[PDB]
Design a protein around this ligand. Sequence first.
Ligand code: HEM
Ligand code: HEM
Ligand SMILES: C[C@H](C(=O)O)c1ccc(-c2ccccc2)c(F)c1
Ligand SMILES: C[C@H](C(=O)O)c1ccc(-c2ccccc2)c(F)c1
Ligand SMILES: *[C@@H]1O[C@H](CO)[C@@H](O)[C@H](O)[C@H]1NC(C)=O
Ligand SMILES: *[C@@H]1O[C@H](CO)[C@@H](O)[C@H](O)[C@H]1NC(C)=O
Ligand SMILES: *[C@@H]1O[C@H](CO)[C@@H](O)[C@H](O)[C@H]1NC(C)=O
Ligand SMILES: *[C@@H]1O[C@H](CO)[C@@H](O)[C@H](O)[C@H]1NC(C)=O
Ligand SMILES: *[C@@H]1O[C@H](CO)[C@@H](O)[C@H](O)[C@H]1NC(C)=O
Ligand SMILES: *[C@@H]1O[C@H](CO)[C@@H](O)[C@H](O)[C@H]1NC(C)=O
Lengths: 552, 552
Amino acid sequence: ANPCCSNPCQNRGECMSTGFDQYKCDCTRTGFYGENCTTPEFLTRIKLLLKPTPNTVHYILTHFKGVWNIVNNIPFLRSLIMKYVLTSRSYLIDSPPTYNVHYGYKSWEAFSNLSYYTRALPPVADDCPTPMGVKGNKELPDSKEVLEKVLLRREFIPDPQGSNMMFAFFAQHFTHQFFKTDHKRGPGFTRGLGHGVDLNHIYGETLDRQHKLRLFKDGKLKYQVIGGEVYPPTVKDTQVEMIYPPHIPENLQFAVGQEVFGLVPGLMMYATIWLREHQRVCDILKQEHPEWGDEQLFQTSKLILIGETIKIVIEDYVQHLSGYHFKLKFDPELLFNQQFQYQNRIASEFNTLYHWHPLLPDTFNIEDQEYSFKQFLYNNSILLEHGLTQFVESFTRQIAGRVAGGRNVPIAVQAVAKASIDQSREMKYQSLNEYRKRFSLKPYTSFEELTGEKEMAAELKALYSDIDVMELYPALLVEKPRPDAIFGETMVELGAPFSLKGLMGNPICSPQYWKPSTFGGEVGFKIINTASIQSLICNNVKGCPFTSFNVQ
Amino acid sequence: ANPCCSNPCQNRGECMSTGFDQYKCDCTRTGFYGENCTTPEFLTRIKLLLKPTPNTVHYILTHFKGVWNIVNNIPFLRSLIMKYVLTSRSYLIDSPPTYNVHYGYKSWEAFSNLSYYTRALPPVADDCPTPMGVKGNKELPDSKEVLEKVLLRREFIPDPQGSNMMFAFFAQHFTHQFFKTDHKRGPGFTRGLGHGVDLNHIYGETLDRQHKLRLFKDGKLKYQVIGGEVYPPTVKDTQVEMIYPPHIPENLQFAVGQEVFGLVPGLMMYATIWLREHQRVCDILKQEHPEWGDEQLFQTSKLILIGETIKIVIEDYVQHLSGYHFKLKFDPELLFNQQFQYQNRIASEFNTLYHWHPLLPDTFNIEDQEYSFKQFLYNNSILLEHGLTQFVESFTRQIAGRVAGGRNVPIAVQAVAKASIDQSREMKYQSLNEYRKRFSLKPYTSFEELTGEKEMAAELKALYSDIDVMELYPALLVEKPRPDAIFGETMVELGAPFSLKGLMGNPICSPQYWKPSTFGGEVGFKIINTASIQSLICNNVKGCPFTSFNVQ
Ligand code: HEM
Ligand code: HEM
Ligand SMILES: C[C@H](C(=O)O)c1ccc(-c2ccccc2)c(F)c1
Ligand SMILES: C[C@H](C(=O)O)c1ccc(-c2ccccc2)c(F)c1
Ligand SMILES: *[C@@H]1O[C@H](CO)[C@@H](O)[C@H](O)[C@H]1NC(C)=O
Ligand SMILES: *[C@@H]1O[C@H](CO)[C@@H](O)[C@H](O)[C@H]1NC(C)=O
Ligand SMILES: *[C@@H]1O[C@H](CO)[C@@H](O)[C@H](O)[C@H]1NC(C)=O
Ligand SMILES: *[C@@H]1O[C@H](CO)[C@@H](O)[C@H](O)[C@H]1NC(C)=O
Ligand SMILES: *[C@@H]1O[C@H](CO)[C@@H](O)[C@H](O)[C@H]1NC(C)=O
Ligand SMILES: *[C@@H]1O[C@H](CO)[C@@H](O)[C@H](O)[C@H]1NC(C)=O
């Protein structure tokens, strides 16, 4: 019955109901006027007829390698480009935040309550007739059918871009500091109240935890030496709360920080590399500051490690991911002369679009072995069995599945994939098209336009019947990838704006923070400014195993 | 022993210890280079030799009434001026926040932990020799001596600017949503985790509270009709936790929202006016939105009331306070084209500089009576006895004490004044001069320069011996007021930057929020844009008592 159920306001205007069966669009600053913020203002016209499309843009970024190699060596230009990608991307995210599972309207509860993931688009009014608003049928197609028909994996489809199990697991570890659904409250609620790259997955979400994981000597994190390698301390020694199956023999119940990283050796591999890293910096810092004490050593390293993380995430992780030939750059000063909010609130659409389960192969091949999901899970004895060096070697040399394209979700995690479907639904999401539009994309005219092929498209059409009812999660995985890429337009276009705001909207990037002394001097500032995934592994892994997020 | 104890870094450069008995200044972006961020860069030189002083600036703003009457009538100019006071003021506040009681260095703990009030200047290293760093004696002068000698009130000194008990009590009520020391943790810790104008003092700091204070009908706040007037409901009925002396007969234990507002009828007078206001808007909104429900009515009104508050605070409260002839303006768009962070962390220095106890008269004269502190306190029977209209009349017609100038602290709240002295000390504050400098002021060369007279100045010199050791709180109250003003340079120059950031760094002011629909339409947007203290009282008080923050 809500007159805004039809989602009538275009170009980002807001729908306000002014009656019962009447509504109104707040086209403020949308650049468009008219009943539904549709009639563009003259200047809008100009901009529109001059702005390339994500694909043409993507094309240039993907081709002309030579030109790019010139561009990448002319600092001004590089900063000029990065600055723009940085600003244009960011302008797509509401900051300060608005809307959440419970609020389709601004509200102070929505703004102040940090327990909710924010929303890029409001939920759907509960009294709307069809689950996507007004379009489509009384109910969406059965998630089990959707799952099986176009999601489940038949033959493992490797990713053409090259993503290996180093990339796959980094993505798990990294995003898991912020993606932490409080399943006690419901999807839509988070436990990462730090809403970003705060490194809580290393240090603990709370002071008590952090304090239990800490050594209180030279600023270091607690640990243990097994074999000759440095591993996280036990749950029995530290007493931190970790999630482990009742049969772990104790002694393998590592502590770490993010309570769920004991569930997969790939996470614990990284969790150990970072513990190692923290300690390393404590040493580097302590050499510079004989006068410092345990806290300033700790607090300063945590700042450096957060810097390294943001550096690696843009110049290695996202670089690989992008496919672009342009050398992305992590340089805070780029936004010192730009209007930019140094704050972030993680949106559930970024949580949902980030369920990259179609990256997990069918077996984890750790040189001389090929473990099953069943044997890999919760098995840190494998980790102690092979040990980082030959783990970075194994995983560096092991492609991951393709995310976009369709039918690549391991039937092992099919329960998780269906869950993504079911939750988006209970969270009253909007169609893939509403989202596409919200992100300046052109809505798909047919399921086939979506997929770029016919059998899945066909199966979708049978199921959803109207392209304008196609759900966001499924369509992201069942979507025509760009050339020899891992994802399609939708995934890169929604996630990009989200990923860059949380990375650049971190306080260490603010003019007041971005200065040497913040990090313990000009030496700690290099640590951040010279960080790479290769350096992270070289410095903390036994033999300087060569690494990459790309399989050779 | 900390080599930074001497506070060697000038022009806002940060001190980093690089040794044990060696330090270093991070003059980044300070505009100055050289060992102590002292040698100005050429461009700095230009700015410096062209920037008037707070007093000459103040002069112009205080004089030339006619010229101002012209400027106040040419929109462009007015926006042009307000925009600059708004931007220049704000650039004096670290946002994102840095430093706190426990951290003299940036730290993630400092940044993320919302339980601490932030710090404009870092605390003093615990291993520094003298309590202000390196300068002064092993101990500051006895607070009791300082209190009695230059703080306590002899003969009531009324404020030459005109402040009445309407102003005095509004400042109490308003600032008390954000100034809420958690005396169980220690000074330096706050309970207003909303860090600003969120109106928790009306709605409750928490959802549970809010929910108990709420009616759940038409979006209204719970209440009761006594006589014929509308007053807050009881603690018995609602069950909210209020602070009241064990002898309040129940039935006079009003609920309200800020747990300490039952302690003084002046607070409860406002707390009842705002309850009334909320309800009023619920009615206005409901008329516009027959389709809305209890939540949207509630959440929307709260946003409007937060708007009115920011409107009244800049165009009436700060307007009066300022003494300026220029018409201040609350207009969010002024900052839509400016770099500005829409966030705020309340600093303890703002808490301390805001203890305006020298405003309280010796008796509360409520037309036909002159109550003593002892009879006014916790006495809401007086409120029910006289009743808002003749309360706004009484208080409108009653000057308040002068804050600056010296010796005007009611001996009745001398315990609170001494406490301000004690706590600043325990919180390891810095001298008035360090603060003056941090706020682009010229340090006082003598106690007499500070006071603008000799007996107190003399008593101070006996006591502190070095001007450079004079403490921030005392000097604020014992300071030469500007002409016929209530405070001096330091109070206006520190508190200004603070007060404007918290007011303008509110999400409702952000481009995404500042739009009609956010407030329920173009109607609720007027409520905000046409708000005045006179309107607030007219609409909710029995006979439209004329009001003002100025005594005739
Ligand atoms: C073998 C490793 C993996 C396993 C077994 C696995 C398993 C799961 C499970 C059981 C959930 C929770 C399902 C629910 O009840 O809602 C989940 C959530 C998630 N997974 Fe994975 N996953 C793995 C790898 C990945 C990878 C490589 C990514 C890539 C980014 C990923 C991203 C996510 C995200 C973003 C969530 C949501 C986090 C949250 O909201 O708490 N997963 N995964
Ligand atoms: C008759 C009313 C008043 C009484 C009896 C009173 C009493 C007190 C007391 C006992 C404290 C706490 C002292 C401590 O630190 O232990 C305090 C704090 C404070 N008072 Fe007053 N006061 C009154 C009026 C005012 C007014 C009119 C203002 C003007 C703004 C004011 C501003 C403050 C501020 C800013 C604080 C700090 C709040 C906090 O940090 O919790 N007070 N007052
Ligand atoms: C820098 C580049 C861009 O903005 O074009 C870029 C940045 C971020 C992403 C990105 C997209 C989805 C999930 C995580 C990151 C991406 F795919 C591409
Ligand atoms: C707007 C005006 C200005 O900046 O000049 C202004 C702003 C804030 C204050 C102010 C000063 C001391 C305590 C509280 C507020 C003030 F006294 C004057
Ligand atoms: C605006 O949208 C409504 C609802 O979708 C539609 O019925 C109406 O005709 C549209 N009007 C214009 C001018 O676009
Ligand atoms: C956040 O808000 C929702 C509803 O307003 C509520 O269910 C949840 O408990 C809130 N959490 C807190 C800590 O206020
Ligand atoms: C765990 O790893 C060990 C050693 O790598 C392996 O032999 C075993 O099969 C795994 N555990 C399970 C339950 O499969
Ligand atoms: C810098 O500050 C220190 C400590 O106050 C002082 O002793 C030193 O002489 C100053 N040097 C310069 C060049 O300002
Ligand atoms: C904030 O920090 C201080 C010390 O680090 C601590 O005492 C306080 O409990 C912290 N609060 C929270 C919520 O972390
Ligand atoms: C409170 O004030 C009322 C009305 O002004 C007065 O009659 C009464 O004596 C006071 N209460 C007490 C306990 O004295």
